[PDB]
Amino acid sequence: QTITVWSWQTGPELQDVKQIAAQWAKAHGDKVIVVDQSSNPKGFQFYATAARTGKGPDVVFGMPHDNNGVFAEEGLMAPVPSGVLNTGLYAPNTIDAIKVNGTMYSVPVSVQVAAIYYNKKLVPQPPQTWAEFVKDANAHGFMYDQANLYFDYAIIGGYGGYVFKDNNGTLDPNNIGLDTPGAVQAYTLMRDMVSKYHWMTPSTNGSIAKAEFLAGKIGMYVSGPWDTADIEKAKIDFGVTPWPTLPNGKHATPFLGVITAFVNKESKTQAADWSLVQALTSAQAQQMYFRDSQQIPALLSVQRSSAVQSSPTFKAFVEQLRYAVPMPNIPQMQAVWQAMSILQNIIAGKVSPEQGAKDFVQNIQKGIMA
């Protein structure tokens, strides 16, 4: 009798999802319960853990697109019905992000590109070049989730590295670019931010950086709209700006992430499920999510709205979009996330950038047991 939605988005966006769900239930009669999985210890892949034993939700809301390759390969996702998605209403990369083996398996709700969040009280105007960045980082501090590939990939790609080679829109899982000479240069810079610039210590991570930023102790840190609520609560007069150009004069290449919503193949109420997904991902819903969290809408028409076009978050997004690399969504991407722990070793100076890079790729190539 009840439709269960698992949401990986929390805070104000979760409140909006609950509101929309309640309105939907009011018209349809079907009861709806929205569960917050954002802090679940098993992470995003918890959907697979649950669905593999037939204990998953009816609908999933707020799932980063890279995770869906696993879910789709295992047959845990209902293909999107014909006509539900109008590809012309999104940027090309946005729709490609929700396709697995050429089939659309989820609906785009938001698009994300990590950026530098800065404290205007400490840094009035944001740095754009590495030189300017060093000056501001030295003067007021800089920290981020340095050992997390999702964020530090911006540096890797900036030096020519890549995860899986993209050719003709298709990714080659065997052609990895995380150990190229360019990637090694990037890892060297990551280590340098600790050993040379002293902006961070080997223990610095995302949690610590966020805490320091909310306390007004550092002027810059790398984040996204998921922190909007907490930043405003801390009363930080924050700004958003693109990653600065790197020491090699090139632009950093942060990942492009697409937040998606989808239906469990095992759900007994597929038609109702897609109707609920439509309500949770409509232009109106996206307008709400933006107003309350600054999450950039996946729909181009909402991106072109006055509220979005005038925002600092969108300005940074549009400035980085051309350099953003969509996260791979093939199953092998999980092997990459699972082997990135070696980045910490490089940043701590326990292993050289060259050796660490080599082992990183070798570990990825071991793959994941089916």
Ligand X SMILES: OC[C@H]1O[C@H](O[C@H]2[C@H](O)[C@@H](O)[C@@H](O[C@H]3[C@H](O)[C@@H](O)[C@@H](O)O[C@@H]3CO)O[C@@H]2CO)[C@H](O)[C@@H](O)[C@@H]1O
Q: What does the binding site for ligand X look like in residue numbers (CB under 6 A)?
A: 8-10, 38, 44, 64, 66-67, 112, 148, 150, 224, 226, 257, 337
**Least separation, in Å, of the C-beta of 71 and ligand X?**
11
Instruction: Let me know: does 117 contact 213? Beta carbons within 8 Å.
Output: yes
Q: Which two tokens stand for residue 121?
A: 């009280």
> Which residue number, 132 or 212, has a Cβ lying nearer to ligand X?
212
What order of strands is seen across the sheet that includes strand 115-119? 142-143, 220-223, 115-119, 238-241
> Which residue number, 106 or 148, has a Cβ lying nearer to ligand X?
148
> Which residue number, 142 or 289, has a Cβ lying nearer to ligand X?
289
Please give the residue whose beta carbon sits closest to ligand X in the complex: 64
> Which residue number, 66 or 136, has a Cβ lying nearer to ligand X?
66
> Which residue number, 8 or 274, has a Cβ lying nearer to ligand X?
8
> Which residue number, 89 or 335, has a Cβ lying nearer to ligand X?
335
**Least separation, in Å, of the C-beta of 134 and ligand X?**
25
Q: Which two tokens stand for residue 357?
A: 């890079």
